[PDB]
Structure formats: C-alpha cells, structure tokens
C-alpha cells in the first residue's frame, strides 16, 4: 500500500521530467552545427615513447606545468616522466600492485593513487630527505577506487565501486562529505574548472552532478544504454561528455539537463575506455577497445581522425594543460605522446 | 646552469633505470593467481591448508614464487573489476556444488560468464569441486534434491573411466561426476584452444591443492610456449 503509492508517485515525477526535458528541446545541436566548417583530416604521429612500465598501464595524469606526468601500472609502480627529455624523475613502489587510478596535485607537490585496495595514498614529492614517502592514507571506503582528483593540497575527492563518492581532508585523514545518490559502481569523475562541482558516471548508465560545498545531488542525466566507463568535463565548465560499453559517446550540458549529440558509427562495436576534451573543446579524443583512439569532433558528429599506434587496448589518455601534447596509456605497458 | 641540470637529470634516469631493471627480474619470477571462490564455498580453508579490498597471500612451491589474490570486501557486482585480472596466469574457481538448497546453478552461470568473457577468453580457469565429503552425505540422504533441481541426473550414466575413491559407493560417484560433466560441457562448448578448464575434486583441508594448481600452472605455460611455435 504505502510502498505501491510511493512508486506510483515516483513514476509521475519521472514522467514530468520527461515532459519538461522534451519542452526545452526546441532544437538539437546537430542541426545548428550543420553549416560549421569541418576540422579536416587530423593526422597525428608519435613523438615520444616511454617504455619504463612492465604491466598494463591503467591510469595517467598530466601536471599543471605541462612537463611532468605521473602514470599508474598494474605491476605496482608510479613513475614520474619528464615528457620533454623522456627521462623519469621518480619511481615509487606501492604496497598494492592493483591500482586503477592516479592523480597529480595542481601545486605539483603531491601525487595520489588508488585501486582494489579500497584506500587512497598521498605522496609528497618535495621531501627534504631526497626520497618520496607516503604521507596520509585514507581508509573510509569499502570498495575498489576508480578515480581521484585534487581540489588543492588539503582536500581530495575520490570515487569507488561503493556507489558513493567521498570528499577527504588530507591533514586529518578523515571523511568530510559523502555522496550517496547513485545505484551502481562509479567508474570516473571530472572536476569543473571552478572546482565548485563535479560529475561522475556510474554503472547505472546515468551521470550525476554534485556540489562539493553541501554534498547534495543537483540533477541526474540519463540516455545511455550501458554502463558508463569514462567521463570528462568541458573546458568552458558548462558541459561534459562520457562513453559507455554501448560503443557510442554522448555529450551533455548542465543547463539544459538533457543529451545533445551522440557519436557512433556502424563499424564501432567496441566500448569506450577513456574520454577527454581538447584545450579548445573542439576535439573529443576517446579511447576504444579496438586498440584505436578516434578523434571525434565535438560540434560535428562526423569523425575527424584516428590514431592506432597502440599494440593493446587503450586504457587511459590525457590532453596537456597547455594543449601542446596528448599522452595515451594502453595495456601494452607503453606510454605514447602525440602531437 | 642548464648544463648542470642536464647532468642531474641523466644520473637520476640512470639510477631509476637500474632499479627498474632489478625489479623486472623479481616481477617476472612470480606468477599471479586469482581466487574467485563463490560465497560460503570454503575458499578460506583452501587458502589456509598450505576494510581491505584484497588479501594478497604469497606461497612458494618447488622454489617457484606464486602470488594468490583473494578479492574480499567487494560488492557482488563483479562486472567491472574482473577485467583487471586479464593478465593473470589462471583464475582459480572454487565451487561448493554440494551446498545446493540452488548454489550449483548460480555457480554454473558464473562459470559460463567467466568462460565467455572477451578479456578472459585467453585466461585458463582451473576448477575445484569442493565439499566432496558433504556431497556424499547429502546424496546418501533419502530423496536427495539433486534430481529435482537437475532432472537429467535420472538418465545420466557413469562413464567407464571414472575411478572411485576407495571406500565410496556408486551413487556418490554418480553425482560427483555428473556435476563435472556439465562444467566440462560448458567449457568445451566454446573453448577452441584459447584457454582450457581443469576439473578437480578437493576436500576442505586437502593439502594437495597447492600441488594441483602448481601442476596445472605448469601445463598452462607449456601450452602457451607450444602456441608460440605454432605447434598447437
């Protein structure tokens, strides 16, 4: 009785949201950008190849200075590479070799990583003793860590398979804010340029918007027919894109609260592993299970170019802060820098 | 001085590369194993016979170091994190089929999903049918609910090559091999040489378990080596 009417009421809210979203859909993104000049045949070639990793690379992240980068591999290493001279500056072993994420602090003095150990480790790269050691360990989660990004040197936001997202205080090493609005495993997250809010896509094929300051869900995005694997935030801070196992990508926007344009082809029958926008936001580079990273145009649904220099499945990729280089990490333990 | 920084960068790379080369030998000298025992399947006893999300157990046999990972404190949604173990030597699967109330059918579907997984198609899976003693006592019970769940058991015939354990009876041998035949049929349905399933019978406190996986692992590497030379 009481349960039945609650579900009936919930359906009425769902119907109203569909009507409200339909009413605001005065036009589609594809129709407006029909007359825009196509990007052209984008041809990109490898410039550097880092062969220091042993096992498959699962995550990588660029630095604020756009020179140094940190990458995570399943062999249990966190090697910091100088992308200019190809040399490596640090190589810190990890207690657990099963790591699925890594982060680079905006100040560049901290590096974090996590994985199937349900904990997040913080390392300080500016030790006065000349060697890098772990600083603080966060053990409030009960599931495998999927992503983690720094707000500053004191607070870090993490997502895991516990369906929940967490906000941490590094100095105290204790939980501060918990997000419990999902129904599936959270796979990735991306901070907005202003840091005030972030999005996270889970296995429910739904993307949420959370406000860090009060820890409340702002809205929910739907439209995917398979679990969301990767997500990224638009440089302007008013949109985001994601990819799922259904072999297609989607672009959403916070203001309209609905999907705008999807990228897919009949050939593409493989899921998306990584997604990140370009510096201008015009190019959407997305990894794929077929050893390729198609460069999908944002304004135009037509594909602009591909890069197929990876031996195995591409697991992670990232565009530089200055937009002068793109580094990709695949399962063949080779980091590839494209320009 | 730019030149001074160049020397510092070069020596740091040389020291790190030397450490990486040393760590490469220890990484290649160990073999990874994944323990995917179902719930209440007695997998804990299989380990001890000789908010952490994983329990790494290291054991050495025949001067060979092995790395066994027991994934714990994780939700039942194993669709995503299972892809991390695509490079494992073999996935150890422990089934308490004797605990049917319908545990066998649930484990039957789980093995089918693992066998046909795209990333796990190249990973061999070794199978342990645990609780063999408890299986015998439940089968001997009057009107055991094995035919009710599996009506095909009423017409299945024991193969002539089925050697029994000294002191048992044909009926418990019937159910013990009937469950094995179903698992073999699932494995051989789409196992076109990419990976193989190794069936075994084990007890809860069997110390031979480490020998069986060690022998099974040796066959996996030998089969892979033959595949390199295209002999298989």
């Amino acid at each position, epitope marked *: 009785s009481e349960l039945d009417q609650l*579900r009936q009421e919930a359906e009425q809210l*769902k119907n109203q949201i569909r009507d409200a979203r339909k009413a605001c859909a005065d036009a589609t993104l594809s129709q407006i950008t029909n007359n825009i000049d196509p990007v052209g045949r984008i041809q990109m070639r490898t410039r550097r190849t880092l062969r220091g990793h042993l096992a498959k690379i699962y995550a990588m992240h660029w630095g604020t200075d756009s020179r140094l980068l940190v990458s995570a591999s399943q062999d249990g290493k966190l090697i910091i590479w100088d992308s200019y001279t190809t040399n490596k500056v640090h190589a810190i072993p990890l207690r657990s070799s099963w790591v699925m994420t890594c982060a680079y602090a905006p100040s560049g003095n901290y590096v974090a990583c996590g994985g199937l150990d349900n904990i997040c480790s913080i390392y300080n790269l500016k030790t006065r003793e000349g060697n890098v050691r772990v600083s603080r360990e966060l053990a409030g989660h009960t599931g495998y860590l999927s992503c983690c990004r720094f707000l500053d040197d004191n607070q870090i936001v993490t997502s895991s398979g516990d*369906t929940t997202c967490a906000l941490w205080d590094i100095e105290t090493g204790q939980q501060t804010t918990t997000f419990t609005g999902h*129904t*599936g495993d959270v796979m990735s997250l991306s901070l907005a340029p202003d840091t005030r809010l972030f999005v996270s896509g889970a*296995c*429910d*094929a739904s993307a949420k918007l959370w406000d860090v300051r009060e820890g409340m869900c702002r809205q929910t995005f*739907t439209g995917h*027919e*398979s*679990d969301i694997n990767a997500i990224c935030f638009f440089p302007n801070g008013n949109a985001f894109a994601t990819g799922s*196992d*259904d*072999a297609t990508c989607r672009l959403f926007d916070l203001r309209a609260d609905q999907e705008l344009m999807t990228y897919s082809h009949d050939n593409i*029958i493989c*899921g998306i592993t990584s997604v990140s926008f370009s510096k201008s936001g015009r190019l959407l580079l997305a990894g794929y299970d077929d050893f390729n990273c198609n460069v999908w145009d944002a304004l135009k649904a037509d594909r602009a170019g591909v890069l197929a220099g990876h031996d195995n499945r591409v697991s992670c990729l990232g565009v530089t802060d200055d937009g002068m280089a793109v580094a990709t990490g695949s399962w063949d333990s080779f980091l590839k820098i494209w320009n | 001085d730019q030149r001074n920084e160049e020397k510092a960068q070069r020596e740091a790379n040389k020291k790190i590369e030397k450490q990486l080369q040393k760590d490469k030998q220890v990484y290649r000298a160990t073999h990874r194993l994944l323990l995917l025992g179902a719930g209440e399947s007695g997998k804990n006893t299989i380990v001890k016979q000789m908010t952490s999300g994983i329990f790494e157990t290291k054991f050495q046999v025949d001067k060979v170091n092995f790395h066994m990972f027991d994934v714990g404190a994780q*939700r*039942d*949604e*194993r*669709r995503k994190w*299972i892809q991390c173990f695509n490079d494992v030597t073999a996935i150890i699967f422990v089934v308490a089929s004797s605990s049917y109330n*319908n545990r066998l*059918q*649930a484990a039957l*579907k*789980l093995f*089918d*999903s*693992i*066998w*046909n*997984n*795209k990333w796990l198609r190249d990973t061999s899976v070794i199978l342990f049918l645990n609780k063999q003693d408890l299986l015998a006592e439940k089968v001997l019970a009057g009107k055991s609910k094995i035919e*009710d*769940y*599996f*009506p*095909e058991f009423a017409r299945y015939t024991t193969p002539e090559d089925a050697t029994p354990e000294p002191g048992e009876d044909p009926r418990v041998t019937r159910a013990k091999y009937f469950i094995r035949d179903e698992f073999l049929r699932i494995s051989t349905a789409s196992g076109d040489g990419r990976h193989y399933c190794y069936p075994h019978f084990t007890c809860s406190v069997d110390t031979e378990n480490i020998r069986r996986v060690f022998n099974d692992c040796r066959d996996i590497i030998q089969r892979m080596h033959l595949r390199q030379y295209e002999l298989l």
Partner: nanobody, 128 residues
Framework: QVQLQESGGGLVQPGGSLRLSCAASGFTFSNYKMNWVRQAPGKGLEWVSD????????SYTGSVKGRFTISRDNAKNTLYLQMNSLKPEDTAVYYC?????????????????????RGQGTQVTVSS
C-alpha cells in the same frame, strides 16, 4: 531511461496455465541477451532461463525444463514466458533482467541483488 516493464501474473490453480510478458524500452531490443530470474518468498534470487540475441539459442534451468516456454519478439520488443502444469513452488516474484553489454554473449550480475537493468517485477502466486 532503461526500464523493463512487466505485465501478467495473477491467481492460478495448480496444474493450470499462465503467460507473462516483459516489455523493453529505451534500448535496442535485439542487441541484448534476455534472462528470466525470480525471487521466492523468504529465499534468495535464482535464475530460470535465457534467450540469445537472435533467439536461436535457448537454455533452461533443470527445475522448469519441459514445464515453461520462453519466447522473444524483436519486432515488438517483448519477452514472453508461457507456463503449463504449474506446481506449488512456482509462487515467486518474477524479474525481467538483461545483459548490460549488448554485443557479448556473456554477462555478470544478472542475479545480483543490486542490479540496475532489471524490471520492477510481477507477483505470481499459485494455490488451491
């Protein structure tokens, strides 16, 4: 959104007949493998039967083999379950689940208690 509406059920005497229809929307019906799972009262969740993407491959659990019949209609994106000669143990809540990844022939967490792409469910009770 990905939802799997279910219709049917009711009160049927033992040994009778019944039909259940599961309706899918929001995704390509033919691309996803469909499974049938039910929850018995005061018990866990179990799996009954599944159908391939094209319907050319069918598997049943032993308890309902020769008793229930499964069918899918990709033209009208519906999943059907025809039952004959019901038994008292048939009383359970039937859930219409699906394979999250379309193109692959395997899937996990179909019987998981926190599965997302599962139908609301319908109550089927059999009694004298």
């Amino acid at each position: 959104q990905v939802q799997l509406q279910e219709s049917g059920g009711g009160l049927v005497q033992p040994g009778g007949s019944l039909r259940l229809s599961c309706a899918a929307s929001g995704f390509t019906f033919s691309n996803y493998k469909m499974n049938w799972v039910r929850q018995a009262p005061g018990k866990g969740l179990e799996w009954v039967s599944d159908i391939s993407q094209s319907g050319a491959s069918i598997s049943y659990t032993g308890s309902v083999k020769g008793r229930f019949t499964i069918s899918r209609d990709n033209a009208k994106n519906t999943l059907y379950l025809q039952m004959n000669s019901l038994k008292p143990e048939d009383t359970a809540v039937y859930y219409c689940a699906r394979c999250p990844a379309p193109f692959t022939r395997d899937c996990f967490d179909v019987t998981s208690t926190t599965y997302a792409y599962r139908g609301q469910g319908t109550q089927v009770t059999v009694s004298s």
